[PDB]
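Supplementary Note 2. Why include the ligand at all?

Several targets in our set were suspected to adopt different conformations when bound, so apo predictions alone were not considered sufficient. For every target with a known small-molecule partner we therefore ran a joint prediction. The input for zinc ion is given below.
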Amino acid sequence: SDLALTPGAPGTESDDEAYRRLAQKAEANAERRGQLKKPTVADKYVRDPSARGAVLKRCQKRCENPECAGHPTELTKAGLPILQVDHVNDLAKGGPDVPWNMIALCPNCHALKTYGANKVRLQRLLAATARRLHEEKLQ
Amino acid sequence: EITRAGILQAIAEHDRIGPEAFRATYGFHAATSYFLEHEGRLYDSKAIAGVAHMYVAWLRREGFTIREAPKTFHRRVGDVRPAALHRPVLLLWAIGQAVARAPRLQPWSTTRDAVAPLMEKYGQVEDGVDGVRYPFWALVRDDLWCVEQAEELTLTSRGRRPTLESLNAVDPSAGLREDDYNLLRSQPEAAASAAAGLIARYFHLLPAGLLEDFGLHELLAGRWPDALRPLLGETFKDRDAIWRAYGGQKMAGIGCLADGILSAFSDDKGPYADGRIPDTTWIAYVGDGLSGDQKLTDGNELMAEHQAVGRALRYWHKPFQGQWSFETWAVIVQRRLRWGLGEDKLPRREFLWVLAPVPSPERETWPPEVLEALEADTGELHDDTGDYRPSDLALTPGAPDGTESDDEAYRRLAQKAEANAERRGQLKKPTVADKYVRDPSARGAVLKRCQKRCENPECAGHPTELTKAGLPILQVDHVNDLAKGGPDVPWNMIALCPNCHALKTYGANKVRLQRLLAATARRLHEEKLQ
Amino acid sequence: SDLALTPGTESDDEAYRRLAQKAEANAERRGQLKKPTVADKYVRDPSARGAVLKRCQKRCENPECAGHPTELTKAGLPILQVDHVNDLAKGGPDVPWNMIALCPNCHALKTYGANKVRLQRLLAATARRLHEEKLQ
Amino acid sequence: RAGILQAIAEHDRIGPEAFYFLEHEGRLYDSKAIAGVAHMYKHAVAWLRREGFTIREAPKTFHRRVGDVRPAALHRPVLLLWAIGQAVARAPRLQPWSTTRDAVAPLMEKYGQVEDGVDGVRYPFWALVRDDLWLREDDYNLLRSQPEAAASAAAGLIARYFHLLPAGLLEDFGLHELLAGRWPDALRPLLGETFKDRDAIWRAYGGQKMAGIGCLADGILSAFSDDKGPYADGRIPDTTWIAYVGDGLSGDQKLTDGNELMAEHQAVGRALRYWHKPFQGQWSFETWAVIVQRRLRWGLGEDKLPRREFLWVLAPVPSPERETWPPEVLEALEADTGELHDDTGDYRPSDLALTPGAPDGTESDDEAYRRLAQKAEANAERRGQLKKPTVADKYVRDPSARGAVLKRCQKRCENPECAGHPTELTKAGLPILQVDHVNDLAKGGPDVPWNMIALCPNCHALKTYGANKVRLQRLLAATARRLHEEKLQ
Ligand SMILES: [Zn+2]
Ligand SMILES: [Zn+2]
Ligand SMILES: [Zn+2]
Ligand SMILES: [Zn+2]
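The joint prediction is reproduced in C-alpha cell form.
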C-alpha cells in the first residue's frame, strides 16, 4: 500500500493517518542505527522505505513547503506526483532517517532548498514545518 | 624459555648496572615499542627475556604486565579525577619531596606520619593515618605510584587497599615512577605545572599553610598558576591543533584538557556576532547540549560544578575567519535559560552561562566587579523562557498566521519587558550582568514592530535582501545606551539599517538624530498600544 | 590630501591618476617579494585608498545602491568605506581597480548578504570600469 | 637544531643500521631519521634546511625516469624498448656495442623513421646515460624479477611515442609475448581509482598539483575537472562527451602550458587521462579521452572578470588503443581539422548570464536579442548543411541562442500554464530556470531561440516526464515562436 507505485483507494485496514504505523517503524529503525559503533556507508546512506512511505501518506501529492510559489497536479508518465521526499537535515550531516526530518517538495522548492540563495532560512522553515506536520498526525 | 623468576634476577641486574651498561655487551639496543613494567620502572622486553635465559608471551606467562609507553606525566596527573582529595594530597606531597631532592622510594612508615597531618588538615578526612592508605595503593593503577614488596602485602576484603596491619608489618618502600621522579628533579617547570594543576583543581581557594606544609613554597609561593599552559594568547588554526598540544577532545567545547582543567570553546559562526555581551567585556556562552532541550549533563554539569565552588576556567575563542586562542580565564557569574536553535534547526531550551573574565585562577587577582557578581549569584537558574516564545526569535521563520497571536501581540512582549525592567530598576546592588545582559523579550518586541524595516524616518534607503543566515540587514539598538542608564525596553529601542546605525553612532549629527529616534521610538511604541 | 585629512588649485580631482600610479608601482614591487611578511600582505597602501576617495566623491560606487546618507562623520569624512572586491587575504592586489567605495548597507551586502557572490562580480566589473574611465 | 651535527656523528660512529636525503661532507643520511635523533640530543626537511644543510632527492624510480624521457625524437625510446625486450627474454645485462648496433639499427630505420639506422643508434647509446637509464643494475633486476614493471614501462613508451602501434612492433621488439592481448593493460592508475585530495593523486603517480592539464610521472597527459557546484558537470547534455575548459586561470587563455600540450595531443590524435571530482565527492581517473574539437568561448576567470577561454571537446574511449575506439569518435576525427572555432560574434560576455549589468550602458536594448537570434540562425543554417555531422556538431550548444532566450524571458518561466515559480536566485546569482529546446536537438530540432523556451524546474519536469508532455510540447512550440516573433517587429 505504502509504496507510491501501488495505486489504491486505500482501505479499510488503514486510514491514511495510520501513517503513524510507518513513522513508528522509522523511529525504531533509526534508534537501532544510531547505536551502531562502526556504521558502514550502507548503514548510513541506504534509505528506510518506512519513513519515505510515511511522508507520502502525509503530504498527499502536494508540496509541504508553506512558501511554495505553486506546483502542478499533473502526474508523471509513470503515474507518480511531480514531487520528491527529501531530508531537511542531510543524512550525510548526521540527520536522522525519520519522517519529522523529511519533507515533500516540488522541483522548484527542492531547488530552493538545495542551491537557493536563501537555502539556510528555508531549511529552518522546513525543519519547523516537518516537525509540525508530523506532530499533527500523532494526536 | 621456560625462564620465569630468573627474570626478577635479570631486572635486579638492570637496576644494579643501569640501562646504558645493560646493552654492554648483552647487545640489543634496538628501539622497543613495547616495554616490561616492574615496580614503576620500564625495561626492554626482549632484552630482559634474553638475560633471564642466561641466569613477550613468555614474560606475560610468568606474571609480568607488558606495556606500551605511558602517556605523559602531565596527562596522567591530569586524569586524577573524582568518580576525593586523597590522591591529589599524596601526589602533591610527592612532588614537594622530589623538588627537595628526597629519595625516590620511601618507606610507608615515614610517608604515613608525614602525610597524615596534611590529609587531616587539607583533605578534610577524620583519620589521616587511615586516609593515606587508600591513595598509597590506588595511585599505582593511575600510573603514578609504585610499591616495592607488593607481593608481601595482604589486600582488604572488598576492593584494593592493603590492610593497615600488612603495611605496618612490611614497611614497603613506595614512591613515584622512575622517569617521573627524574623529570621532576631535572625540570622544575614540570613540577610547578603538575602542582599548579592539582591546585585549582582541588585547592583553588589556596588556604594559607599550603604551600608551606607541602614542599612547595619556594617553588610556587609567588604565584602558583604561572606554570600552567597554554599561555594567554597562544593561537591555533584547527581545534585539532589545540588537541595535539593540550589534549581533551574535539567534541563541542565544554571539556577538560589533559591537565584536567575545564575549557570552554566559542566559535563565531558569522561576522558581527561574538560571545561578548555588548558594552561589556563579559561573555554570554551558550550551553552544551547540541539538538534538544539542554540538561545539566556532560559540559553543563561541569559548568554547574564550577559555578557552585566559584572555580575559574579557560575560555577559548575563534573569531570569524580567524584562528583559535586561549584568550581569558573566566568565572561563572550567572546561569540562565533561553530559547535557541539546535543543530536540527529546531527551537530548544538552552543554558546561557554568563562568564566574567579574570587575569588568573587566583581569587586575589579578580577585580571587585567580579567578586561582587559572584557574591550576588545564588547559583540558581534564571528561566527567561517564560518571557518569550521561539516565534519571537528572529531565527524561527513563520507567517505567523498562527490564529492565536497577531503581530501586534507584540504588546505581550513589551509588557514582559516593562515588568522585567521595573524589577531591575529596584535592584539595590546591581551586577554588570544585571545592567548589560539584554532582555530577549524587548528585542523580540522591536522585531515584531519594525517588520524588516528601518525605523529611522530620515532613512536614505536600505536593501530588502536578507543575510546568508536569512535575517534582515538591520540591528535593534537602544536610543539611550544601557551604559548611560537607559532602560531595556522597546520604547527605548529602534531598528536601524547599517547606514542609519552608523549615523546614530558616529555621524556628524549623531546628537540630533538621537533625539529624533527617541521621539519616534516612543511614538511607534504607543501606536501599538491603542 | 590625497586622503580626506584636511579640506585643489594644483591638482584636478582626476589627478587621482597620480595616486593610482603609485599604487600600481608599490603593488608591483610587493608582488615580487619572495618571502612576504604578514605586514607586506595586509598593511594597506594609503595611496590606493586615497585614489578611491578621489574617484568617488562622497558616494557609493555600487550601482545597485538602495540609497545612502550624505551627512558626514564627526571627523568630517563621508560615511563610506573603501574595500577590496577581491580580498587581500585571497591574493587580491592593493590597487584602485580592485577596490570599491561602499556605504555601510552595500558593504554589509558585499560581506554577508544573501547574494554576496553575484555582487562581487558586479563590483569587480564596475571597479575596473570606473578605474579605466579616469585614465582616458 | 644545528645539534644534528651530533646525530650525524653518531650515524658515522655506529652505521646506517643503528642510526629524501641529507648531504654532509660527501655522505648521505636519511633526512627524517637525522631530524628525529637530533630532537633527542613531517616538517623535518624544512627544519634541516633552516639549519645550514643541503638536502638531496631520493633516486628517481625506474617508472619516473623512463617517464622523463620526453622530446625537446624516437631514438631514445626505441633503444629503451629494445632493452626491455632483451631483459624480458633473459638476455645478458651488458652487451657489446657491436651486437646492439646491428640488432637495433633495423628497428631504428623502420620505427624511428631515421635514414641511417646504424648512425641512429649512436645518439641514444650515449645520451641515455645522462637520462639515468644507461641497462642499470637495479633496473635490469627489476625487469627480470617483476614483469608488470617491464609491461608498464613499455606501455608508457608505446603510449607516448608509438600510440598508433604499427603491426610487427611487439615482435620485432622483444615484447609480443609480454604485451599480448592489450599493451596499455599494464598502465596505472586503473579506471575508477579514487583519491581524496589532489595531493593524494600526486603522491601516488606524480606530476604536479598545479593546473588542470599536466603529465604524470609516466609522462602521459592527464586533465583534471573539478565540479564547482551541484547540477553542473562537464558532460555536454544528451551525450557522454565532455566540454573541458582550458588552462589559463584569470585572463584570455593562450596555447601555453596545458593548452599547448592539449593541442599537441589533438594534432596527432592521442588519448589522455581525464580525472573528475563530482560535487562533494572524490577524485577518480574515470576515462581515457581524445580531443575531438577545440573552441573559444567567453567565461569568467578567478578575478571574476570576463575572458576568452578554450573549450576542449573531449570524447571518452575505453583505452588508448585506437582499435578500441567506437565509430562516432573515429568519425569525429578525421572531421576535426584541428583548428580553433572562435566565440565572439553572437556572444558578448553579456549576452550570457554570469555578468550582471543594468545594462548601465544603454547602447544595447534588451530587445537586442535580435543580434543574438540572428547569429543563432546563421550558425544554425551553416550546421544544417553539414553532410556528415559529428556528435559534437549536433549536441554542443550555441551560446548565442541560449543568450537570446535569457534576454527574452527575463528571469521568468515562459510556459503560459506555469503553476508558479520563485524569484529567489541561486547562490551563484542566477535564476532558478533552465533554457531548453521544445524540439530536442537529438530528434533533429534546430539550435535557435524560436525552438527554445525558459522553464522553471516544475514546468521542465512537466515537459520532460509529465503525463501530458506531448500537448505541452505543442503549446511550448507555439509560444516560443510567438515570443520570438514579438521581438522582431
Ligand atoms: Zn513547492
Ligand atoms: Zn535606515
Ligand atoms: Zn550604497
Ligand atoms: Zn514554469
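The beta strands of chain C are 81-84, 99-102. Chain C touches chain D through 14 residues (CB under 8 Å). Comparable summaries for the other entries are listed in the accompanying table.
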